[PDB]
Design a protein around this ligand. Sequence first.
Ligand SMILES: COc1ncc2cc(C(=O)Nc3cc(C(=O)N[C@H](CCN)c4cccc(Cl)c4)ccc3Cl)c(=O)[nH]c2n1
Length: 346
Amino acid sequence: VYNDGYDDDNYDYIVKNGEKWMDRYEIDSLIGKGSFGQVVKAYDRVEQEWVAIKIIKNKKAFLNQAQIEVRLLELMNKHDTEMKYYIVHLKRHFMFRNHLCLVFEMLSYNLYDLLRNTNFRGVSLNLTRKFAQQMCTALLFLATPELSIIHCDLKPENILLCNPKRSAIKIVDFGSSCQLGQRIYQYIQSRFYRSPEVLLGMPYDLAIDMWSLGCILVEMHTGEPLFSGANEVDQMNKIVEVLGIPPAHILDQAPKARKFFEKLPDGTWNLKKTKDGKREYKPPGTRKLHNILGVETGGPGGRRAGESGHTVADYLKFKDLILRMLDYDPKTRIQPYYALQHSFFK
Ligand SMILES: COc1ncc2cc(C(=O)Nc3cc(C(=O)N[C@H](CCN)c4cccc(Cl)c4)ccc3Cl)c(=O)[nH]c2n1
């Protein structure tokens, strides 16, 4: 029996609808589960408003990591600039029944649920442009020298509408985030959104969030993930289908280079040889973003043909922006300040 009956076998707090905490919070319901615990909808008797409360797992490794999230949340929430409002606001936190509880302003549903409500047709390029611009302003706020925060898990489920009928958004879940200059953990980011430097076991910096953003923005407009790998080897092959073999100056410094590639006598790299007969991937660089976005064929799958807001020129700008965000080299990958000056946003 777990934590005197309050917890299940997965270190989660067994949620009971109606339950009341510290004579203050009235638990309405479970919203969802996640690696780190649960999120519930609750009414705050005192402040007279609905909130969302993230209940962290009762397990030392999860609690300790979640204290980092709180520190970062508070450092971001106290900053004196208007860009801070693209990050969810942590109102407060407390321990209860041996679970750290994080109390948040209430938001609306996530970008994934938005995509699914369109049956994966994708949202319009105009909307995509509004999400991209907010995301890049958020990333600029994270890059503020005093913060230097890497989110480390951007993806649609971590971007929420503030309001179900508007286009304002916020970034949630700094559960896996760190600041620059802090022990390198391989195996970060969700696989579809994971940068090549992380797949390659290399050091990483704030640019890994720009990589993920590029992937997310393509998925929001097409309705489906750009790089849909079932495992790391598949993930790297799908990136390669689109962007080519990564450049030698990267692979030469990459501890995991030989998990995916091999080096030729002349110092060039190729994908690792496979069983003769096996053909699984398009050749390196032949799956063009140009075609995935249908720049000149009516947009993704032709579905935007003859709509306003979706011109060849609009697509070429978007495409150019995506490719600058999916630069293999993290030192030349477009940074937030410069992404914001891009003509996609004129
Ligand atoms: C209209 O219908 C609706 N549906 C769903 C809603 C979900 C929320 C909501 O989830 N808010 C939330 C979530 C988080 C978090 O950190 N979410 C993460 C995900 C990470 N993938 C998460 C989700 C579930 C469990 C854990 Cl441990 C973590 C952090 C801060 C907040 Cl304000 C919400 O506010 N309004 C919602 N309205």
